[model samples]
Target: HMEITTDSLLALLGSEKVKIIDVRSADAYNGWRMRGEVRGGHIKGAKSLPAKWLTDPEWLNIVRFKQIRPEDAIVLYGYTPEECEQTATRFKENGYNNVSVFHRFHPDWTGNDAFPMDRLEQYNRLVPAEWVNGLISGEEIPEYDNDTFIVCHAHYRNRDAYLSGHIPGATDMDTLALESPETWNRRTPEELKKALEEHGITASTTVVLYGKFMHPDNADEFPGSAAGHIGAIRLAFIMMYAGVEDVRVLNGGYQSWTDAGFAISKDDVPKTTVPEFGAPIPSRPEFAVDIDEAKEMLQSEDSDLVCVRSYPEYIGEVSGYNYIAAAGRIPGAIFAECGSDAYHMENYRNHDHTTREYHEIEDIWAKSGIIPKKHLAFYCGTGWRGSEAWFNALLMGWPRVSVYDGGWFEWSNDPENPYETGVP
Candidate 1:
């Protein structure tokens, strides 16, 4: 009686009366057939509530954040019945009036084409916790096609964060190595090549980047905003543009690491520098668009200069940054809301710091006609948020996505450039 049948589950799938939760790994819900299921992804409209969240101190808050209440009926399913029961028990214990588990995810739901399902198109690009745990533990991994690799604990002027604790065998990298403090833009190709060489990264190296969610115990003292997770993706974009064929992010970042109760080492990992980079600098030059191209995109019907900033920044209510004196967005740029402020990408990320479901992101983009078919260049006050959103699109396998290197910071500085405020 406690188990939910596929037909019964189907009836409850998209209703607000029942919350369908996928208790599998985030990667599985993102489209990985983690358990060799006939199909990828989860039941349609199911919310990702990875069993890993059991280890998160904020799990209850995350549940509440999802708007699941005590009176709500919850249906849980995953690759394993035990996992589903485990999460359902947690919900039942916490006052959810009705909790049910589905045990036949292997062939029933996923195997049936008539039943609906959803997943991230580029989910494989977004690696999960166990994948990293396995790869580093010397397990012969699947879905990984490279022998050489580098794991970077990306921070901005905050080696102390890495020193505090980091994944074993991961090196520390300052975001400055890829972007400049003066310009807030990516370093030139030559500079990037040198940085990559010094960091022991070749074009073929499988670079896995991640950062602490909000780190450096003393946030008020050091490690400015966008210094961690966003910082990781920022470097990821630069690395990809510099021609690193394989770049992956640790989903949910450092938070995901801790959630797994993995070992943390304080030892400083040594870097083995390469004398020569394997590829020419800027091999993927199309990934970074300059101001001229951005201006042209604004006028082109086939392209979109997406302003990834908050409504306040879009409407000229705030400059969105201390250094940026002028406010307002680029004239003719399509608004792609980036969350509360310039520093945080709350809208694009989940409460656990992993990427929000790709379908959710696409639906939001669709409302503004920001389809993957268009040549989309995302920009924020500087380039951090822009780069993060750009990485999201890239992960989704959008063919023509890029970060406008000279975001509002560069555009607003030029008085000659026309700007706009308030809703269009």
Candidate 2:
């Protein structure tokens, strides 16, 4: 993770050659974008493409119309880094060569008293609860042991919530603190081990990540990244892959905890010692598939590489609040409602937010005939939701799996590209 500070961005703010794109939505952009510093309109000549656009099929054509090359160097600052990454990944998939994320994007800018955001209230909206339900239900949610992990929100603000109180015995893991600032510069394998140990995480620890109420969407977020929200899940996955066997994502997360009127702690628990830890297995090298590679597979009519999303949500017929992009599914994805059947409520009417048992998942998918189709490159609007599927698939020990961080947000939008809809 390469982190560029506020100071660096400030220095380049006025440079005409530099393209600064605000990834937050038009509503958030106008209402409180940049907290107020830079107006929502944009940085002088900066482009105002919502990161959501990157996921929308319309984004590709928009970009081409702007005459921006896929390989251009671009800097994306949205409500947060998670969104910036969403934008960056989509840009990469579209063949944009260079991209970077900004720290404390728009909110911080506004918090600093930057004002004059371009208000586009009409377009600012979250997915309706019903649509959101359709999308969330399309993944493999797993039940796990009652274990405690840290929680935080998108911006890492609201320490009051977690510090105030969390699940009993659960520690607070500030999502931003996941990767130390120093680690971003560089770190050795030994340094990586040391970092994990510092967080009070051990191989035996089962993590349940939680984020505050507001989820941060990246400039290129297909759905939203949920920052600390999805960060927790991503972190849990990372730890598991690093050899920590027990891990799970908390449903409802910190939001549910506080909503239930739980107590919060203000005392700081300083670490007393750093224990020695080693990876149970070697970490897999992180790699991504660019558009050319994606096209090659598509053209080959590869039955193995299936897109993962719910049948309804995959097409434009259904939508999720988090899914802010346009409708229409990718050309080849197969539908599988990823929702776990474990905690269904009153005939799926009143569902429990908690995860279900692994065997339950196996049973459900088995009868549904939902198996990993091929190498199984999974995608959703943004990458993390697809990753939730990736997480379950890998846990089942699927033979091969890959997640296109760009996901359908980047795929479906190009008018030049083909797409599928309705039960295919």
Candidate 3:
């Protein structure tokens, strides 16, 4: 009963006059099917501003980020009219006056394939906090039928980040346990199997990972300590490659948990160590490309060596890490644009630390000639940022995506390898 019929809502979708907002969790916006809708994902061109974000003091800043203005006719849609009204009311409380809600969203719009919509290729792989809660509470959840499962609070050498507060019954996993400091590549397969078993992970186990994001102001000797969410994704990539049947990353990491008002426990949960790992290490070896593959990719027209580092890092401004003394990029590596620096990935993630709108990422990749048809090996200073980009492509269901395991660090270490400085 707001301003539009279903037809009118569809017309306003691609129209500039109306800014359509999917006022639900970012999880739903990214195609979670949280409400058991016929289809997943949001309306094309809709800006995801979860109504729950109204609790954050900087919720209006998200409006600024999404470029939603008071001058625009605001159209919102979510689970129900009750939910839509709450979002519409929030806009009204602000300076936004032209507020309305599109009542028909779930069955009417989602069930119809004729309507334009988009979502992450494999959004279910990235889960909502509530879903994780159900797993801990022993409630049978969707897309998860594993007899064994483990939730880990992932961090990089920061126990306080875990000990401070974490999801109840979740064990903490330091990134060091999976990766090495010397080479910064994944540890030996033998070592990985041990670490996985110690953390109670295996080929048959479903693992969910999330981490606390220590901000830039919290800089430390460890560069990745600040980018905790990337640490979570980093671990997810490792687990998947190590042959874990299912690996789920908390969409916004610990941020999502806190936003949901879930109870956090400081107790150090006891590890449920399984007697044996169900499968061999690295069930998917192609997920990682080493120096040999990186060189091959750079030479082959069918493959690409993608530089997922910051522009500054790509252009020889900074090494993007304190430990790695290398300054330039691998010559011929295509820049995938990972935002300001190694510790940040603003281009690929939302302000809430969730993945950005899928179409936006697709367009960015398209503009840069980063197509899905080709083999793309993403690389950053170490493997953290590269893994983050690779994870994005993986979740998008790109046929061929891998992290250049030995990134700029290993490549630069070899004096024989060619490197470039300055702009491409």
Candidate 4:
């Protein structure tokens, strides 16, 4: 791995041998360049390569930024080690020859408050707040059609939302009750069959997930990212993968229903029906893909396996190994902001810093106009969040899909390998 230290980094000051990368969000960079501490600035020599830049599906058409060279030595850092680990792993996957992550990253540079600094927000575009607002709302999902049913049952947040209010006639079924680690520890046809049985879900039944809303009355969180959209997406993907024929996400979830002035019910419980599903197709496609396969597609100039990660993490813009137990993301995988929406589902007010489903994602894919026929593989810092997107594709009926369990945390730490991150 390339070297990293407060002293070595200080020595590389004017030389180009070492690169200092900052992998925080654009807002984090603008509001608090260094952990919300400073009013407006970051380490002088550090490049302001925010993490989102890496996952731009339209990177080729957009004038956003470029990937870093594979052979350069990199030093990455972020607000916290959990954040840093994602970026570091991204670098290695892209084939960078040398990389290092710095724990206590900020203190390593700014402790004396004499570090060189600069600001570049003027060149960055601001993400509009309202785009995500209209996508999810109460009216978006008022009632289920033929086979569709809302999935939930006295969940901590769901119960809390029910106490406040809920969509009229929506039955509660606990999705968590249907899941087992063994089902996913390794993916297979048999595992899939068992998972479906746990939920009492049958092939014909359509399932929809609803989470407790941000507020009892409001449908959209004032700002976009604070909604439970991720939770809904998560539920939709799992149901569809388990062989539910028609699974759909409730646009506004339960909160949107309440906002639309719909009648609310608290004691509503539907009769349980154990829907018997057909045996899973043992011919299910490969559940994993390697970097060579990913690179070959990119080489043939016909690849759709987008790395769902942040720009900084994508380009070795920061250290990703400082988190305890958590390490990094899949190498060469761009940042897709996995936990952003998942964290918000339960407590938006407090978890607003989290990532949310980028409503533009579909549009971005459309603009790229890439063949939807290509296979897509998703890996987050781990497999949990990646499962969210993987299942969504299955819901969309995307041709081929896979989820990488050995994400960045596992891929980046191997000494036998090289790492890549930065403006390639």
Top TM-score prediction, candidate number: 3
Candidate 4 at residue 341, lDDT? Answer: 31
Winner by lDDT: 3
Tens-digit per-residue lDDT, 92-155, candidate 3: 8888998888888878899999888888779888999989999999997777777777889998
Clashes of each: 0, 39, 1, 47
TM-score of 3: 0.92
Candidate 1 per-residue C-alpha lDDT over 251-325 given as tens digits, one digit per residue, 9 for 90 to 100: 889888987789999999888999989898888999999899999998899999999999999999988776779
Regions of candidate 2 where Cα sits further than 4 Å from its true position: 1-164, 168-231, 238-282, 286-312, 317-324, 338-350, 357-360, 363-369, 412-416, 421-424
RMSD, one per candidate, in order: 3.0, 22.0, 2.3, 18.8
Sorted by TM-score, highest first, which candidate order results?
3, 1, 4, 2
Task: Pick out the ten consecutive residues of candidate 4 with the lowest summed lDDT.
Answer: 123-132
Model 4 scores a C-alpha lDDT of 0.46
Which sections of candidate 1 miss by over 4 Å? Answer: 7-19, 36-38, 54-74, 89-99, 107-116, 215-226, 422-424
Which digits, one per residue and each the tens of the lDDT, describe model 4 over residues 1-424?
3336666666677777666666765334432332425334455555545555456454222222333466666777676556666567666765665777655555545455555555433211111111112222322311224433334422322434444555544555433333332332234546555655555556666555555545322233222122334445444444555456655444345544444345666665554546456546332336455545654444444444555554445555543223313323344433454322323322111122222222223334455442356666666443445555565444344667776544554455455545564565
Error in Å for residue 210 of model 1: 0.7
* Candidate 4 displacement at residue 382 in angstroms: 3.8
For candidate 1, the 10 contiguous residues with the lowest summed lDDT are 215-224
Q: Where does the lowest 10-residue lDDT sum fall in candidate 3?
A: 216-225
Q: Cα deviation of 383 in candidate 1 (Å)?
A: 1.2
